[PDB]
């Protein structure tokens, strides 16, 4: 599942 643009 890919992480949101700001998850990092």
């Amino acid at each position, epitope marked *: 599942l890919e992480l*949101d643009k700001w998850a990092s």
Partner: antibody, heavy 123, light 108 residues
Framework: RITLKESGPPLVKPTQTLTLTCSFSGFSLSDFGVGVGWIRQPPGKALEWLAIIYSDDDKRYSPSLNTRLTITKDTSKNQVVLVMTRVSPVDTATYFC???????????????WGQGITVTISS | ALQLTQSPSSLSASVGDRITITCRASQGVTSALAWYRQKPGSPPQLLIYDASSLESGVPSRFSGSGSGTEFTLTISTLRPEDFATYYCQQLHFYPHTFGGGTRVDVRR
């Protein structure tokens, strides 16, 4: 502050293409990290995420609708456009576009929504 | 993808009541969960962002807590305008999922 308004045809024939436009003010698609998303809601049903596009132009579509959706942005017009192909009656719903704050923490939410445009698919 | 389960899906209450509804995620979404209230005929309205932060302008009776896979929205004292449908949304993974919603109506 920020407001958004969806526009497009209220009535679309099955198979045809549905083109929606989100016009907004109070922010621009050149502010850092800012996004504009599309959410739909079938009559009496729950909200369904469709897609989102950002200032730097990356975008994401809902996995199930991604060979049918295309999201773009014209920054001189301050508009975002969503194109959905081969619509069918199940696509009948209210379509909302919404704003997502960019990093200044609170990017975790769609903070301002349009009033929504209800689109009916029928031949 | 990520399944967000809201419960109860339907809830009956009265003005002045204290209610707490939940939103469960199948995978951890850290604190990237938002809560909205939607009244019939109107678009969703942000209440809580980032799981526990009260959105500017939102009444103090609303509060949220949780992290990872468990989240709750509490209304300290139910008002007439609160009889609506509430939704949670996680913005940690793509696609951004919405829960199925919780319906709060007037008890009789």
């Amino acid at each position: 502050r920020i407001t958004l308004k969806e526009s497009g045809p209220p009535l679309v024939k099955p198979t045809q293409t549905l083109t929606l436009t989100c016009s907004f003010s109070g922010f621009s698609l050149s502010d850092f990290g800012v996004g504009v998303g599309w959410i739909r809601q079938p009559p009496g049903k729950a909200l369904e995420w469709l897609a989102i596009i950002y200032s730097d132009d990356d975008k994401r579509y809902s996995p199930s609708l991604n060979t049918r959706l295309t999201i773009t942005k014209d920054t001189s017009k301050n508009q975002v456009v969503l194109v959905m192909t081969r619509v069918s009656p199940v696509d009948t719903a209210t379509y909302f576009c919404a704003h997502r704050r960019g990093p200044t923490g609170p990017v975790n939410a769609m903070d301002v929504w349009g009033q929504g445009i209800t689109v009916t698919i029928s031949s | 993808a990520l399944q967000l389960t809201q419960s109860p899906s339907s809830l009956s209450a009265s003005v002045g009541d204290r209610i707490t509804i939940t939103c469960r995620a199948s995978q951890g979404v850290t604190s990237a969960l938002a809560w909205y209230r939607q009244k019939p005929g109107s678009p969703p309205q942000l209440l809580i962002y980032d799981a526990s932060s009260l959105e500017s302008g939102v009444p103090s009776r609303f509060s949220g807590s949780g992290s990872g896979t468990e989240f709750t929205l509490t209304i300290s004292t139910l008002r007439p305008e609160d009889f609506a449908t509430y939704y949670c949304q996680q913005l940690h993974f793509y696609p951004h999922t919405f829960g199925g919603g919780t319906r709060v109506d007037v008890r009789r």
